[PDB]
Each structure stands twice: as structure tokens, then as C-alpha cells.
Automatic annotation (TrEMBL), chains A, B:
It holds the Pfam family GST_C_3. This is glutathione transferase. Residues 1-78 form the GST N-terminal domain. InterPro entries: Glutathione-S-Trfase_C-like (IPR010987), Glutathione-S-Trfase_C_sf (IPR036282), Glutathione_S-Trfase (IPR040079), Glutathione_S-Trfase_N (IPR004045), GST_C (IPR004046), GST_superfamily (IPR050213), Thioredoxin-like_sf (IPR036249). It comes from Bombyx mori (Silk moth). Keywords: Transferase. Glutathione binds at Y7, W38, K42, M50, S63. It is an enzyme of class 2 (transferase).
Length: 203, 203
């Protein structure tokens, strides 16, 4: 199909779709829209945001919903309702970690940012990280089902952005499992080939 | 099946599952766990939080993932991948509105809460509400597909909690469409019967 993907020139919420498209052997226009040019595209999007995936002229918005749809098309969404559920479940936990980190990162008052961070360090982060370590260990380096699923692509796509927001670049020294879903996705030749060819960004 | 649902004695994130179970004609133990007793249940949950749905001893956590699963079991998740996608997409937009309201509501510093609110009033809320009004209008009073789906139950379950966080109890005076998904769910006899029999809470 004619496929076009629209997102900013970063990984953040959109890289997981690019990686999923690479997995599926689906060639696509990687439309990396600069901040300066974005406003001319914004009213053409379903909700006024990116990412947007366009397939034969039909637009799909909302990052996780797009990854789930691509995961289903590429056989990465489990074999029945209960398996599909587990992936949704573990990805929704990942989104809580992202949301908690985002609440610190996007605080523009450096003083309030500082107290929010301290508070999360003692009350949510330790529990999130131990829980993520349990899940990655239970699933042998994967986010769900003990094998490759679309949830590994969501994890791989957002991992650096998460780390940048957590302000622990050194996260995976205490938790070497945290690298494993990325390794699983980058082990896939097509995906490795796309990543080797693609720009790098810090988030 | 033997079904048990565990959540706090409020609607917030868990009411949508109770309503979906009522729709499905699935009798269940509505286990409303008080804050004071919660800690004894917390280590028995998959992630250390509620809601948790237990079916024949197997636990399902993560609210949206549970609603999607129940929606699929009850034929409320569309008829193909593209329809299922649209529901996921529009519910993920709803979650952004919730997340934005939550960032104000859970601010414990009343001064900072005040500036965050003012900032959202001029920069995200007007766009969210117009966009939600468009979606509800396009879909004839529903969150997606122009008909009843599991996304209407998510909306119905969280609507009061959202309003309490937005600090616009008067939301649906400017936007009478905002009441419609609730009307669609409450029009269903089993669901109306459960709601008539169930406790009321302000969120
Ligand atoms: N829930 C949406 C969130 C999308 C979102 O926040 N997009 C941001 C970038 S990561 C954006 O388009 N900002 C531009 C704007 O709002 O004008 C999704 O996951 O796709
Ligand atoms: N992403 C989870 C969030 C669950 C959540 O935040 N649960 C809260 C109540 S709404 C909770 O269990 N708080 C108790 C605690 O953390 O000890 C979901 O949607 O189910």
C-alpha cells in the first residue's frame, strides 16, 4: 500500500511505529516534520497531533492504538483474546511509567521539578522499576508472553525518551534486563537494517 | 464463570468494567475495597494497584486493557481490525483528556495547582473539548463507530471523575453532546438495572 508516516524528528512516541513498519516489510514515506513547519500540517491531522499513519489515504492517529493495529496485522498480537490482553496490560503499565516521568520532565519550574522528582524517587519509581524488572524477567527479556510482541516495539521506540525523562541515563546498570526488549527488536534483520539507516536522536 | 472484581469504592477508573460486566449479563462479586483495608490486598495484585478482574482465579489488571478484553468478549469491539482500531484510537484521546485533568487535580500545592489550571484553560482544554464535541457529534452521541462500543463504557464510567478533575461540573451546558455516551449506556436495561442498584459516588 501507499503508506506515509508523519511524526517529529525524534523517537519519543512515534519510533515504535517506524520500527513496526520495518518489521512488517512495509516500505513507507518517513515524513519527519520539523517544529517550524508542523503548524501547516496540524489542521490536516485527526486530532491536531502526531504521530499519524496514513495508509492508502486513510489516517490512523494515537500511537499505542497504531502499534496495536500494526501488531495485529503482523502477527505480533498473540493468538487469542487472553494473550492479546496480556500485551495490552503490560503496555498500559509501561504507559504509567512514561506518564510519571513526563510529569517531572515537562515541569518548567526547576524548583517544583526538583521536589516532584524527589517525591517520585521515594514513592513510585522504586516500585515501577522493580515491577518492570519482574515483568521483563518473567518474560525472558520481553514485555509480554515471553516472546516478541508489538509491546517490545513500543518499549524499544520509547526507551531513550523514558530514560531522558527519568533523568537516569544509567538505568540499565542496576537493571540490565531493561536493555533486553531493545535487543530482541534490533536482532531482527529488517529492523536492524532500518535502524542502521535511520537518524539517531537522544530521545 | 466465577468472576470477582476488585477496585476502590468509587467510579474513577473501575466503573467502566462494572458496567461492561452488567452489559454482558455476567454476575460478579463487586469487591469494593476500602482505603484502610487495601494494603492487605495490594501484594496479591499483578502490579500493586486496582482495578483487578479475576475470572476463574486468573487475574486481569489495567483498566483500559480489561475494558477492551470485555468489549471483545461482548461484541462491542467492532467487526474488523479497522473498526477495532477506531475505538482504541478515540479512547486513547479520552485518556489524554483524563491525564491533563489529573495533572491539575493531583497537584497538592494549591498555588501551583492554580497556575497549571489557568495554563490548561488557554492551551489544551479549549482544543480538547472542541475535539471531543466533534467526535461525539460525528459518532451520533458515541465515542466511536457511530454506535455502542466498549469506548462508551470507558467514557460513562469515568465521566464524573473527569468532571471533578476538570473543575467544570457545568461542562455539558456548553456541550450537551457530552452527556450522550452516558445516555447510550444507561439506556440498556441490564446496565440501568445495575446502576439503579449500585452505590453513587461523586467521582
Ligand atoms: N495520545 C497521543 C499523544 C500525541 C502527542 O502528544 N503528540 C505530540 C508530540 S509527542 C504533538 O503532536 N504535539 C504537537 C501539538 O500538540 O501541536 C498519541 O500517543 O499519539
Ligand atoms: N494504569 C492502571 C492505573 C491504576 C491505578 O492508578 N490504580 C490506583 C487507583 S485509581 C491505585 O490502585 N492506587 C493504590 C496504590 O497505588 O496503592 C489502570 O488503569 O488500571
Amino acid at each position: 500500500p501507499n503508506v506515509k508516516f508523519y511524526y517529529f524528528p525524534v523517537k519519543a512516541l512515534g519510533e515504535s511505529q517506524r520500527l513496526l513498519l520495518a518489521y512488517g516489510g512495509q516500505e513507507f514515506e518517513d515524513n519527519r516534520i520539523s517544529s517550524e513547519n508542523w503548524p501547516e500540517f496540524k489542521p490536516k491531522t485527526p486530532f491536531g497531533q502526531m504521530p499519524v499513519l496514513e495508509i492508502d489515504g486513510k489516517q490512523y492517529a494515537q500511537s499505542t492504538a497504531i502499534c496495536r493495529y500494526l501488531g495485529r496485522k503482523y502477527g505480533l498480537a498473540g493468538a487469542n483474546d487472553e494473550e492479546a490482553f496480556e500485551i495490552d496490560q503490560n503496555v498500559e503499565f509501561l504507559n504509567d511509567i512514561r506518564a510519571s516521568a513526563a510529569s517531572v520532565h515537562y515541569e518548567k519550574d526547576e524548583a517544583v521539578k526538583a521536589k516532584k522528582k524527589a517525591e517520585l524517587e521515594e514513592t513510585k519509581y522504586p516500585f515501577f522499576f522493580e515491577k518492570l524488572n519482574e515483568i521483563l524477567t518473567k518474560n525472558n527479556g520481553h514485555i509480554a508472553l515471553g516472546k516478541l510482541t508489538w509491546g517490545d516495539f513500543v518499549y524499544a521506540g520509547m526507551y531513550d525518551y523514558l530514560k531522558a525523562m527519568l533523568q537516569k541515563p544509567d538505568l540499565e546498570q542496576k537493571y540490565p534486563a531493561f536493555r533486553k526488549p531493545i535487543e530482541a527488536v534490533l536482532a531482527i534483520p529488517k529492523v536492524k537494517a532500518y535502524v542502521d539507516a535511520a537518524p539517531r536522536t537522544e530521545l
